[PDB]
DNA sequence: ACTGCTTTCGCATGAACCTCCCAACTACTTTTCCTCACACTTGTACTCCA
């Protein structure tokens, strides 16, 4: 319900839904072949809030823009 | 009586204040997000004691 929805999205989600598309396609890429392509600054997991939108940034509140960049690693 | 004691007055034109706020960079909060390992049971393992 839109009344107090509290949607559960994190940067751990956008890798997890990117891992499941790899096993339905039956790919040899894994979470060792994801954490080696994100912590080596290859696909934009880290620092995503700050450089990606460039026009949609400013009206987003402070705790929401905190979650969308690559804050920690999982 | 007479002084001091006033009072108008001027060659013609050109022109020649102060407190509070918005500063600047510090620091110490806000605005709700995500991420989970913790309490008592219960079921299942391999002992038991009569």
Swiss-Prot record:
Subcellular location: Nucleus, Nucleolus
Domain of life: Eukaryota
Entry's family note: Belongs to the RRN7/TAF1B family.
Function description: Component of RNA polymerase I core factor complex (CF) that acts as a SUA7/TFIIB-like factor and plays a key role in multiple steps during transcription initiation such as pre-initiation complex (PIC) assembly and postpolymerase recruitment events in polymerase I (Pol I) transcription. Binds rDNA promoters and plays a role in Pol I recruitment. After binding of UAF (upstream activation factor) to an upstream element of the promoter, CF is recruited in a SPT15/TBP-dependent manner to form a pre-initiation complex.
Subunit structure: Component of the core factor (CF) complex, which consists of RRN6, RRN7 and RRN11. The CF heterotrimer may further dimerize to form a hexamer. RRN7 interacts with RRN6, RRN11, SPT15 and RRN9.
Miscellaneous notes: Present with 398 molecules/cell in log phase SD medium.
Comment, domains: Although it shares weak sequence similarity with SUA7/TFIIB, displays a similar subdomain organization as SUA7/TFIIB, with a N-terminal zinc finger, a connecting region (composed of B-reader and B-linker regions), followed by 2 cyclin folds.
Protein's name according to its UniProt entry: RNA polymerase I-specific transcription initiation factor RRN7
Organism: Saccharomyces cerevisiae (strain ATCC 204508 / S288c)
Underlying gene: RRN7
């Amino acid at each position: 319900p839109q009344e107090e929805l509290k949607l559960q999205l994190h940067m751990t989600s956008t890798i997890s839904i990117l891992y499941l598309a790899s096993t339905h396609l039956s790919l040899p890429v894994y979470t060792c072949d994801y954490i080696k392509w994100i912590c080596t600054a290859k696909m934009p997991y880290f620092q995503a809030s700050e450089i990606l939108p460039k026009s949609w940034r400013i009206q987003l509140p402070n705790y929401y823009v905190s979650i969308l960049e690559g804050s920690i690693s999982p």
